[PDB]
Structure 1
Amino acid sequence: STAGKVIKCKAAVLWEEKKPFSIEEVEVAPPKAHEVRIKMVATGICRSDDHVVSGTLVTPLPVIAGHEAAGIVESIGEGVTTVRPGDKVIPLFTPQCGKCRVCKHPEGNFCLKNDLSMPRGTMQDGTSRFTCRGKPIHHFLGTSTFSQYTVVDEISVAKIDAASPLEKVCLIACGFSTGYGSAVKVAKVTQGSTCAVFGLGGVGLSVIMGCKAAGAARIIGVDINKDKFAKAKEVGATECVNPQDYKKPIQEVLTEMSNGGVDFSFEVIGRLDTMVTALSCCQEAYGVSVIVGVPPDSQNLSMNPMLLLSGRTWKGAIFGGFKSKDSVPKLVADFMAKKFALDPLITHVLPFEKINEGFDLLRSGESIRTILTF
C-alpha cells in the first residue's frame, strides 16, 4: 500500500553545523530504477556522524546523516534483483558496484561510486529522495540512516540473514567491521605479535577484537580517557596507557615497552598528531601502521619520510578493507554462529527520538555505541 507512493515519516535533519538534530517530518520519494526503500529498525551513532555536526567531515547541508544501520525493505524500484520487500538489509556506506576497477581488484574495496572522497550528498543519479519543509535535503554516503525510511541505490545495500537481530547487527554496517577488518585484513596482524591501538571507542575496541582473533600476544590500548581501559581489557587489551601520565611522548613510551617498536599500530581517533605518533611507534624496519581515524577536513600532516625509508609500511582503509556487499552478509552469518561478539560495543540503547541524547553521551565520553531503535 505504500509502494510507489511518497512516504511521510520522521527523520533527524541537520540544518546547520554545531546544532542539535531536528526530529521532524520529511517526505521520502519512492525508489527509482535500481533503488531500494528501507524501513529502518536500528542505527548506531558513529563518531563519523558527529564529525558531520562538528565540521570535521564536510558534506553538503542540510542533510540526513547516519550510516551504521539495519532495516527491512519496504519496496524496490524497477530492475532491482538483489533484495526483495520484507528482506532484512544493511545499507552500505561504501558501495560495491561490482563493475569498476576497484571492485574487480582482489584487494580493492573503495568502490569508485562512493560519495566519501568528494561528497555530493545525493543518490547515484545526482538527485535527492528527501524533502523537508518543502526543501530538498542531502543524503549522506548514499545511506542516510537517521530516518524512519531511507532510499538507497542497489549497489549500497546488502541482504542479510532473515533471522538477524537488527539491533545488534547494525554495528556490522560500520564500527565493528571497520575495526575488525583493519586488524585482520588490512594490517594482517600475526600470531604472537605486539599491537598498539590508539583510541578505545567502538572502532578501536573492534580493532582489539581483531588483533586478539589474529593471536597477538600483546595488545596495548592507548587513550587519554582512562574510563575506556576496563572495556578495552575485557575485549583483549593486555595493558592500557594514557599519554597524559607520561613526561615523554607516547611513541617513545611504546617503543620502550615493546623493546624497540610494535609490530602493528592503529590510529583510531582522527588526529594528525596521533597518525604520526602511531607510525613512529611501530618498529622502524618491519612495522606496519594503519590509519582508521577520519582526519579533519583539508588538513595536512607533517612527517619525516625517514620513518618510511627504514622499512615501515603506512596504510589506511575504509570499512576495514571489506568489499561491502560481499562481506556484510558473511559477517552477519559469522555473528549468528558466535564467531565474534557485538554486545561489548553496545553501552546504551535509546529510541530514535532521543538521538540528541545519544550524541551527548558520545561527546561526554560516556558511551561506546548507543543503538537507536525506530
Structure 2
Amino acid sequence: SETAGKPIECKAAIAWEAKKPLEVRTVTVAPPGPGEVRVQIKATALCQTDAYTLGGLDPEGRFPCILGHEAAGVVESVGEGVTSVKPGDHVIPCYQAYCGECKFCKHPESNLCVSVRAFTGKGVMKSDGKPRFTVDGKPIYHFMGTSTFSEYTVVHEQSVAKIDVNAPLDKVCLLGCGVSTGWGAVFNTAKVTAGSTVAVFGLGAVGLAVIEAAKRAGASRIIAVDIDPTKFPTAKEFGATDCINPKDHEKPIQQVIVEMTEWGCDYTFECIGNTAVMRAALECAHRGWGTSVIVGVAAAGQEISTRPFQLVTGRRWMGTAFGGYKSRVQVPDLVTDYMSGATLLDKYITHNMKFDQINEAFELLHAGECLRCVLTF
C-alpha cells in the first residue's frame, strides 16, 4: 500500500459546534492501532440521529466531531491483531458493536454489546483513549464509533461487518442503521405474527422499513400515521393498507386507531421520537396482548407515561436498538437478503448527491422531502 501505516489526508465534513452548518474541509486520519480498522467510505447516508446531535440535543455530544453513521466502504488497512477483516474487504461500519463474548452478545435476545461503547460514546478509541482525527494538530472527535463523514475513518474491529464483495455500496449503506432498525423491530423485537394488525407512527425511512418487514411478515392490515399526507402514497407502495393523519381528527390518535380496529392493533411501532406519540402507540396496542415497540429516540430527560391499567390489561411496552440485530454476524445476512431480490432497499433512496453538498442534504432532511440521501465523494 501507498497509504498503509501512514497518516492520510482526506475531505471530511467537520462539525465545529452544534446548531451550525458543517465545514467540508480537509482532515488527517491517523493509521489504525491495535484492534482497529481504517475504512475507506465510498457511500454514506444522512440519518435523523445525525441532525439531532447537530442540534445540541445530545448530552453526550462531543464537539468538534465528524458525524455520520450509515455507510459502506472498503478496508484500507488494519492494526495489529485484526484477523476478522483484511485490506480489500467490503464493510459496513456499525455503531452497535459485536464482541461475541460479553453477556449481551451471548444472550439470544439482545445485541447491546459492551465491547467498546465506553469509548465510542466519548468519541475516542479503546487502545489509547485518544481519538484518531486531527486538524492542524488539534483533535477532532468520533461520533457513534463510526464517523462516516470522511473519505477515510478508523473504527474498532468489533464494529465492522464484512459483506458480500458484489453488493452495491451506494445501496447497502442504508443497512447500517435506519432501514435495518425498522426491519429488525418487526422481525426481532416484536416478532410480528402472520395475519397480525400493525400500526406504524411516522413514515420516514424507519417507518417505511417497519411497514415493509410487516408485509414480509404476513401482516393482514398495516395502518400508517403521519402529520404529512405527502408520505402516504409512498407508504401505500411499501404496503400500508390504511393511512391516517392525526390532524384530520378531533379524538386523540390512539382512540382513533382503537376505533378503526375495535380493540387496538396487534403491534404498534413509534418511529418519530415524540413521547406523546409513544404513549399513544402503546394505548392503541391491542387490549390483552398488544405489543408497542419504541423505535425512535426522544430528547434526553423527557419521559414516557401511561396508566398501569394499560399493562395490567395486557399490553407490553418495549423498545429496540438497531432493530435488535447482532451487527457483525447479522448485517452480512441483511446484505444477503438484499442480493436475493427480496427487499425494497432500492426504493428507500430518493436523492443521490455528492459529498460537497452535505449541508443541503441536511436541509432536504429538516423539511422531510427525502427519505434517505446517499452521498458519494
Q: With structure 1 as the length reference, what TM-score do the two structures score? A: 0.98
CA deviation vs aligned residue, 1:208-262 (integer Å, no higher than 9, x gap):
0110000001100110011111111000011110101101100000000111111
Structure 1 contact 7–28 (Cα < 8 Å) conserved: yes
Is the CA contact (8 Å cut-off) linking 1:114 and 1:141 kept in structure 2? Answer: no
Quick one: distance in 2 between partners of 1:117 and 1:107?
A: 24
Aligned partner of 2:98 in structure 1 is 96
Q: CA deviation at 1:309?
A: 1.4
Relative to structure 2, which stretch is displaced further, 82-91 or 129-138? 129-138
Instruction: State the one-letter code of the partner of 1:224.
Output: I
Equivalents in 2 of 1:29, 1:74: separation in Å? Answer: 12
Q: Write the mapping of 1:253-272 to structure 2, written as runs, cut at 5 A.
A: 253-272=256-275
Matches for 1:157-172 after TM superposition, within 5 Å: 157-172=160-175
Q: Partner amino acid for 1:167?
A: D
Residue pair 2:121, 2:145 contacting (<8 A) in 1 also: no
Structure 1 residue 115: deviation in Å? 3.3
From 108, 124, 133, give the equivalent of 2:126.
124
1:96 Cα deviation (Å)?
A: 0.2
CA contact 1:115–1:121 (8 Å) conserved in 2: no
Displacement of 1:145 in angstroms is 0.5
Return the alpha-carbon distance in structure 1 between the equivalents of residues 99 and 284 of structure 2.
37
Residues 117 and 193 of structure 1, relative CA distance in 2, 3 Å threshold: farther
> Contact 2:337–2:343 at 8 Å: present in 1 too?
yes
2:70 aligned with 1:50: no
The answer to whether the 8 Å contact 1:94/1:114 transfers is no
**Structure-2 separation of matches of 1:216 and 1:84:** 41
Q: 1:291 aligns with which of 294, 302, 305?
A: 294
How much has 1:134 moved relative to structure 2? 2.6
1:198-217 per-position Cα deviation (integer Å, ceiling 9, x unaligned): 01000110000110000001
SS of the equivalent of 1:266 reads: strand
Amino acid aligned to 2:51: D
Residues 190-209 of structure 1 mapped to structure 2, 5 A cutoff? 190-209=193-212
Q: Any unmatched runs of 5+ in structure 2?
A: none
Aligned-pair CA distance for 1:114: 5.1
Q: Structure 1 residues 46, 281: closer, same or farther in 2, change over 3 A?
A: same
Once residues 22 and 298 of structure 1 are traced to their aligned partners in structure 2, the CA distance between those partners, rounded to angstroms, is 30
| Letter paired with 1:144 | S
Aligned position for 2:33: 32
Contact 2:119–2:125 (Cα < 8 Å) also in 1:
no
Aligned positions of 1:224-303 closer than 5 A: 224-303=227-306
Q: Read off the aligned partner of 1:76 and give its amino acid letter.
A: V
Question: What amino acid sits opposite 2:32 in the alignment?
Answer: P
Cα drift, residue 143 of structure 1 = 0.5
SS in 1 for 2:142: coil
Asked if the contact 2:43–2:73 (Cα under 8 Å) also holds between the matched residues in 1, the reply is yes
TM-score (norm 2): 0.97
Map Cα deviations across residues 310-355 of structure 1 (whole Å, 9 max, x no partner).
Answer: 1111110111110000001111011011121212210111011111
Between the aligned partners of 1:333 and 1:118, the Cα distance in structure 2 is: 28
Alignment of 1:1-374 (within 5 A): 1-58=2-59, 59-113=61-115, 115=117, 119-125=121-127, 126-374=129-377
Counterpart CA distance in 2 for 1:133 and 1:357 is 27
* Letter of the 1:145 counterpart: T
Contact 2:293 2:318 in 1 (8 A): yes
What CA distance in whole angstroms lies between the structure 1 residues aligned with 2:273 and 2:327?
22
- Structure 1 residues without counterparts, runs of 5 or longer: none
Alpha-carbon distance between aligned partners in 2 of 1:117 and 1:322, rounded to the nearest angstrom: 21
Q: How many residues align?
A: 374
| Whole-angstrom distance in 2 between the partners of 1:311 and 1:342 | 35
Moved over 3 A (4+): 114-118
- CA distance in 2 between partners of 1:27 and 1:111 (Å): 29
Give the letter for the 2:358 counterpart. Answer: I
What is the DSSP-based 3-state SS (H/G/I as helix, E as strand, rest coil) of the residue aligned with 1:74? strand
CA shift for structure 1 position 116: 8.4
Q: How many percent identity over aligned positions? A: 54
Within 2, Cα distance between the matches of 1:101 and 1:108? 9
